[PDB]
Amino acid sequence: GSHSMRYFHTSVSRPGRGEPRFITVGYVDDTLFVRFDSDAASPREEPRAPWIEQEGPEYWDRETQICKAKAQTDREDLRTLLRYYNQSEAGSHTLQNMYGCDVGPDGRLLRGYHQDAYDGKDYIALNEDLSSWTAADTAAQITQRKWEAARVAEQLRAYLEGECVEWLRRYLENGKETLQRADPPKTHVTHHPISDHEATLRCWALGFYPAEITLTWQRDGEDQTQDTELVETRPAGDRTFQKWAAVVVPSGEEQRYTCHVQHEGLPKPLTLRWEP
């Protein structure tokens, strides 16, 4: 909504090679701030953003205990699911979980999430009401009944309405100067001749934060929808993102084309042209 916090988790069984590998990372908006990898020497949750490092030793200890506890629960859950789906112990399997909260500018919960997937397909998810479940097949329906009986939705709901939101606002204030500042895209158009008769115009949006952005190409003000090649937004590797859009045009027609950029870091949507 206005801001968000998310935790991602992946356990992968490794039959004939070792205990399942467990990896989890947390984000506030599009900023990574913590990671835990069970394959790390003496595994501990570690800081990955500047503003979280001020948390004290009890924070790092409790977060590490939660991670090792989730790594164990997933191992058991991997065993359970082999039974629910009647699979062999010799095959590798993946369990994924994402939960977190979005808050509005009031700083209250807008939406909470808690969902899981087995082997890359939906398994069971907490609905928006933070009260009922959507199970994706009959094995997940076993889980659903057990989780209804054990009143699990209620515990997650208390967390997502409380602790989730409270520490997000904490992270937002402590990391205010980076997380509450939108970095607008640096834009420009390049021109790449294909032959003597045609060329590609590529509209670049670089160094921006957050990741969300709209890039479009228009010819004499009309949208070149089915003709633009639009790559997926990608990390520059310095916590900002990059994106480009391209269109191939007839030589001599270049100046009829316009690139239009929307990003919340921009006061108004940009229009740019190749300035030869």
């Binding site: 935790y7 058991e76 057990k146 989730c164």
Partner: peptide, 9 residues
């Protein structure tokens, strides 16, 4: 800060 709840499938 992570949820401490440990639930099992």
């Amino acid at each position: 800060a992570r949820a401490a709840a440990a639930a099992a499938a």
